Amino acid sequence: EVEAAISDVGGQQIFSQALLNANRRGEAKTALAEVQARHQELLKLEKSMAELTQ
């Protein structure tokens, strides 16, 4: 007559992935992309003070 055939229900697991804040944007965001123009200024101090020391 009868027996077993399909059984369980209460039993499962799940992993979990993750995205990230957008503002993050490219690494260049404050104190990163400005270092290009901040360097020309610093080269200006170096120079103007080279005039100073000479």
Partner 1 sequence: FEDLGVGGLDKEFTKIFRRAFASRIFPPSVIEKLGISHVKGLLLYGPPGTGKTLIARKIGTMLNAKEPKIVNGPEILSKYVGSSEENIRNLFKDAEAEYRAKGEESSLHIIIFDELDSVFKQRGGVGDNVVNQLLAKMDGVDQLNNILVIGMTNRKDLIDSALLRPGRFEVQVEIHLPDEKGRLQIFDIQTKKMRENNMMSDDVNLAELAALTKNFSGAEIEGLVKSASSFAINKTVDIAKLKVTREDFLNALNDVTPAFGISEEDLKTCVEGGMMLYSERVNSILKNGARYVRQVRESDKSRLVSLLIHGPAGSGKTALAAEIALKSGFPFIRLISPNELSGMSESAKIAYIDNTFRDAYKSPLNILVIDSLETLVDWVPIGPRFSNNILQMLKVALKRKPPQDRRLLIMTTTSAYSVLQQMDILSCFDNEIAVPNMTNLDELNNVMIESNFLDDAGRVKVINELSRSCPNFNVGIKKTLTNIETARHDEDPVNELVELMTQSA
Partner 2 sequence: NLFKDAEAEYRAKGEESSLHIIIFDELDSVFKQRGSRGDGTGVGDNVVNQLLAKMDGVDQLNNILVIGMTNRKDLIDSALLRPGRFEVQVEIHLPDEKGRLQIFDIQT
Residue 19 interacting partner from partner 1, partner 2, none (CB closer than 5 to 8 Å by kind)? partner 2
Distance from C-alpha of 54 to C-alpha of 48, rounded to nearest angstrom: 10
Residue 51 region, left (φ>0) first, then alpha (ψ -120 to 50), else beta?
A: alpha
Stretch that binds partner 1, among 6-14, 18-26, 30-38, 39-47 (CB under 8 A): 6-14
The encoded tokens of residue 21 equal 């804040």
Answer for which of 4, 12, 22, 48 binds partner 1 (CB under 8 A) is 12
List of residues contacting partner 2 (CB under 8 A) = 8, 11-19
